Amino acid sequence: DALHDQASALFKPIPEQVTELRGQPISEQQRELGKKLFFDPRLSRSHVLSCNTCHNVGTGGADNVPTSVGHGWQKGPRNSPTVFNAVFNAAQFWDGRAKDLGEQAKGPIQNSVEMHSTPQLVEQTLGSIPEYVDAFRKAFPKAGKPVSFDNMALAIEAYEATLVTPDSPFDLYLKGDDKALDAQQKKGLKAFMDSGCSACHNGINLGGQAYFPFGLVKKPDADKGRFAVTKTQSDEYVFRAAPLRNVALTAPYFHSGQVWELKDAVAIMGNAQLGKQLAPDDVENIVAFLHSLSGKQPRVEYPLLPASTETTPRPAE
Amino acid sequence: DALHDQASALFKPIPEQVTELRGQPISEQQRELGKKLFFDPRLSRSHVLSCNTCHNVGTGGADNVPTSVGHGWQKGPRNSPTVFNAVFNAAQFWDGRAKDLGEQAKGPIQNSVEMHSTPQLVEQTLGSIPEYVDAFRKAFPKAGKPVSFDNMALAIEAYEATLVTPDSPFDLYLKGDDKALDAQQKKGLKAFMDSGCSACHNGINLGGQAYFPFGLVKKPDADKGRFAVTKTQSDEYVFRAAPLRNVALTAPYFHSGQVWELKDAVAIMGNAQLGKQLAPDDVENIVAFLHSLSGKQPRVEYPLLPASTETTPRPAE
Ligand code: HEC
Ligand code: HEC
Ligand code: HEC
Ligand code: HEC
Ligand SMILES: [Ca+2]
Ligand SMILES: [Ca+2]
Numbered sequence: 001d002a003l004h005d006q007a008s009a010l011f012k013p014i015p016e017q018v019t020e021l022r023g024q025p026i027s028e029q030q031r032e033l034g035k036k037l038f039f040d041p042r043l044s045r046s047h048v049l050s051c052n053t054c055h056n057v058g059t060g061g062a063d064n065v066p067t068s069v070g071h072g073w074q075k076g077p078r079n080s081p082t083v084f085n086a087v088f089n090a091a092q093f094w095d096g097r098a099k100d101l102g103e104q105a106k107g108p109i110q111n112s113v114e115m116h117s118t119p120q121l122v123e124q125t126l127g128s129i130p131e132y133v134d135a136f137r138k139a140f141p142k143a144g145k146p147v148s149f150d151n152m153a154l155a156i157e158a159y160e161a162t163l164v165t166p167d168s169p170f171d172l173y174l175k176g177d178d179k180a181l182d183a184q185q186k187k188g189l190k191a192f193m194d195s196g197c198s199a200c201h202n203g204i205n206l207g208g209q210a211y212f213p214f215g216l217v218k219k220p221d222a223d224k225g226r227f228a229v230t231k232t233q234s235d236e237y238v239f240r241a242a243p244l245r246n247v248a249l250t251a252p253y254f255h256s257g258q259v260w261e262l263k264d265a266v267a268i269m270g271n272a273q274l275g276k277q278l279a280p281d282d283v284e285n286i287v288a289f290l291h292s293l294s295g296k297q298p299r300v301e302y303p304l305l306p307a308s309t310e311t312t313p314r315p316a317e
Numbered sequence: 318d319a320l321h322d323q324a325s326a327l328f329k330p331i332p333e334q335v336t337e338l339r340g341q342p343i344s345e346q347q348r349e350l351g352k353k354l355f356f357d358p359r360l361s362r363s364h365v366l367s368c369n370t371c372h373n374v375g376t377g378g379a380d381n382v383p384t385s386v387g388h389g390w391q392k393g394p395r396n397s398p399t400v401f402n403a404v405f406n407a408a409q410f411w412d413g414r415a416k417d418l419g420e421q422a423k424g425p426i427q428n429s430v431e432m433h434s435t436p437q438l439v440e441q442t443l444g445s446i447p448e449y450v451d452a453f454r455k456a457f458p459k460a461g462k463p464v465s466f467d468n469m470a471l472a473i474e475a476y477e478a479t480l481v482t483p484d485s486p487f488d489l490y491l492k493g494d495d496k497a498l499d500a501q502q503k504k505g506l507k508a509f510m511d512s513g514c515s516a517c518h519n520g521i522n523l524g525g526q527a528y529f530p531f532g533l534v535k536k537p538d539a540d541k542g543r544f545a546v547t548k549t550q551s552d553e554y555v556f557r558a559a560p561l562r563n564v565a566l567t568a569p570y571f572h573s574g575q576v577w578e579l580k581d582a583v584a585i586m587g588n589a590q591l592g593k594q595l596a597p598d599d600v601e602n603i604v605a606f607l608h609s610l611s612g613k614q615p616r617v618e619y620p621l622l623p624a625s626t627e628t629t630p631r632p633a634e
Contacts, residue, residue, distance in 0.1 A: 307377070
C-alpha cells in the first residue's frame with residue numbers, strides 16, 4: 001500500500017525491549033536498582049521528590065499538571081514530558097538558545113540531582129544504606145567505587161530503557177497489520193504527512209529529534225483562538241519538536257502546558273503556517289490518528305525501598 | 318513457655334487477610350478500584366496529592382518526613398502514621414481534646430478529601446472518566462448512584478484492608494514457632510511487658526486502641542536529653558498510643574516526628590515514669606524486639622489510571 005510506503009520511510013516502531021545501553025548490556029540487577037532509585041524520594045534533599053513524582057508511571061509517565069520545575073536546565077516552569085520512550089530522544093529539553101543547547105552538557109539525571117540535592121549528598125545518602133551499597137556492588141561488579149553518581153545515573157537509565165511502550169496500533173500497522181488503523185486513522189495519517197506535520201514530528205518517537213524556532217505563545221489577541229505557535233524572536237531561540245507517542249495520555253500540551261485538548265493542540269499546529277492549512281475533518285482524523293500512538297503501558301511493581309539508617313542525612317529545605 | 322503465655326494474653330497476630338468489612342465481603346473489583354483511588358492524585362483539587370504521597374507503600378507506608386498536613390482533624394502538622402494495618406485501629410488520630418474526639422465523627426478518608434478537595438468536586442472528577450464510572454458499577458452493582466463519595470470511601474477501605482503485614486517474626490512466635498525471636502528479642506519482649514509498655518501498647522497492633530494524657534514535648538531543658546513524654550496540660554487533652562507494628566521502618570517518631578532513632582524513642586518512653594525505669598541492656602533488647610514487628614511488606618503493582626477527559630476538572634490551588 002502506498003500509504004504504508006511513505007509511512008515506513010518516515011517512521012519506525014518502538015522495539016520490544018532495549019538490551020544494550022552505551023554499548024553495554026543491561027543486566028537485571030541494573031534494572032532493579034534503577035527502579036528503586038527512580039522511586040526513592042531520598043534523592044531530593046527534602047526527601048519528598050522522586051522521579052516518579054513528576055514522571056508518574058501510572059498516568060502516562062507525566063504528572064499531567066500545567067508545569068513543574070524539576071531540572072536545572074530550566075529557565076522557568078515547563079510541562080513535564082513523559083519518561084516513556086525518552087531514551088530514544090536525541091533532543092531532550094523543551095527550549096533554549098542554540099549556543100547554550102551546545103553547552104547543556106548535562107543530561108536530565110544530573111540536572112535534576114544538582115537542582116534538588118547535590119551529587120555529594122546523594123552519594124552520602126545512598127552510602128549510608130547497606131541494601132543499596134550491596135545492590136550497587138551486585139549491579140556494577142567491575143567498579144572501584146560502586147556507589148557513585150556515575151553508576152546511579154547508569155542504573156536509572158537502565159530502568160528508563162525499561163519504560164518503553166511497544167505495540168501501539170500504529171506500530172502494529174507499521175509492522176504489517178494493515179487492519180491496525182481504521183479508515184479515519186488512515187485519513188489522519190495521510191493528512192499528518194501531507195500537511196507537513198511529519199516534517200518535524202518524525203522518526204521512532206514522531207518528534208524529539210530536533211529543535212525549531214517556533215513555540216506556543218498567547219496571542220497579543222488576534223484555546224485555538226487564544227494561543228498560537230509562532231516564530232521565536234530570533235532563529236537562535238528554539239523549541240524541541242515534542243515526541244508524540246502516547247500523546248493522548250499526557251495532556252495538557254506544549255511547554256507551558258496551556259492547552260488541555262488535543263483537538264485544539266492539533267488545530268493550533270495546523271494553523272502555524274508550517275504546511276497546508278487544515279480542514280475540520282482533518283483535525284478530527286488526525287486526532288484519531290494520534291490516539292493510535294498510545295502503546296502498551298509498562299507494568300510496574302512498586303519497589304520496596306530500604307530503611308534509612310542513623311547516618312542517613314535527614315530532610316532539609 | 319510462661320513468656321509465650323503472657324505474650325498471647327496481651328497480643329494477637331495480624332490475620333493473613335481480611336475478607337469482610339462492615340459485614341460485607343470484599344470483592345476483587347472493590348480492591349482494584351480502591352487501589353486506583355489510593356494512587357490517583359486527582360482526588361486533590363491540585364492533582365498533585367494522592368494517599369500514596371504521604372502514606373508511601375514503598376517506605377513502610379509512611380512518608381518518613383517529620384510532619385505533613387493531610388487530614389482536616391489536624392490542629393497542626395503531624396508525622397504521617399503508616400497505613401499498614403491501620404484498619405485494625407480503633408483510635409485513628411494522634412491527639413485531641415476528649416470531647417472533640419467524641420465529635421471527630423469523620424474518618425481519615427472523608428477528612429482528607431474535604432481538606433484537599435471537596436466531595437462534590439471529587440464526585441464530578443471521577444464521574445467524567447468512563448473507566449471509573451464502569452469500575453464503580455462493577456464494584457457496587459446494587460447501587461443507585463454508583464459514583465458517590467460513600468462508595469469511594471468503601472473502595473479505599475477495601476484496598477486498605479489489603480495493606481496488612483502478616484508473618485513478622487513476632488507473629489510467627491505468637492503462632493507457635495518459639496524460634497522466631499532470638500534470646501535478646503525475648504529479653505526485650507519480657508522487658509516490654511515488665512516495664513508496663515504493654516499497658517498502653519497492646520492488642521493486635523501493639524497500640525492504636527486508646528488515648529492517654531501523655532505526649533512528647535521538648536524539655537524546658539532539664540534526643541533523649543532534649544525531649545520527653547510528659548503529662549498533657551489536663552487529662553482532657555490526649556494522644557493516641559502509637560501502634561508499634563513496623564516501627565523500625567517508619568522513623569522519625571512521635572506525633573511531631575522529632576526523634577529519629579528508635580533507641581532514643583524507647584529510652585524516652587522508658588523514662589516517662591509509666592513503669593519501671595529502664596536499664597541500658599533493656600533499651601537495647603527492646604529495640605531488638607521492636608524489629609521483630611516488621612511484617613511482610615505488601616507487593617503492589619502500580620495501577621494504570623485512566624486518562625482525564627474534557628469534562629474532568631482542571632487543577633487549581
Ligand atoms: C518535577 C519536579 C520533576 C522531577 C522531580 C524530575 N523531572 Fe524530569 N522533567 C521534569 C520537567 C518539567 C521536564 C522538562 C524540563 C525541560 O525544560 O525540558 C523534565 C524532563 C525530563 C527528561 C527529558 C525528556 C526527554 O524526552 O528526553 C527526562 C528523561 C526526565 N525528566 C527524567 C527524570 C528523572 C530520571 C528524574 C529523577 C532522577 C527526573 N526527571 C526528575 C520534571 C521533573
Ligand atoms: C516543526 C516546525 C513543526 C511542525 C511542522 C509541526 N510541529 Fe508540532 N510541534 C512542534 C514544536 C516546536 C512543538 C512545541 C511547541 C511548544 O511551545 O511547546 C510541537 C508540539 C506539538 C504538539 C504538542 C505535544 C505535547 O505537548 O506533548 C502537538 C500535538 C503537535 N505538535 C502536533 C503537530 C501537528 C498535528 C502538526 C502538523 C499538522 C505539527 N505539530 C507540525 C514543531 C512542529
Ligand atoms: C499528607 C498530606 C497526607 C495525605 C495526602 C493523606 N494522609 Fe492520611 N494521614 C496523614 C497524616 C499527617 C496523618 C495523621 C493525622 C493526625 O493528626 O492523626 C494521617 C493519618 C491517616 C490515617 C489514620 C491512621 C490510623 O492508624 O488509623 C489513615 C488511615 C490515613 N491517613 C489514610 C489516608 C488515605 C486513605 C488518604 C487518601 C484518601 C490519606 N491518608 C491522605 C497525612 C496524609
Ligand atoms: C501509655 C501511657 C504508654 C505507655 C505505658 C508507653 N507508651 Fe509508648 N507511646 C504512648 C503514646 C501516647 C505515644 C505517643 C506520644 C506522642 O507524642 O506522639 C507513644 C509512642 C511510642 C513510640 C513512638 C512510635 C511512633 O512514633 O510510631 C514508641 C517507640 C513507644 N511509644 C514505645 C514505648 C515503649 C517501648 C514503652 C515502655 C518501655 C512505652 N512506649 C510505654 C503511650 C505509652
Ligand atoms: Ca503534557
Ligand atoms: Ca513515623
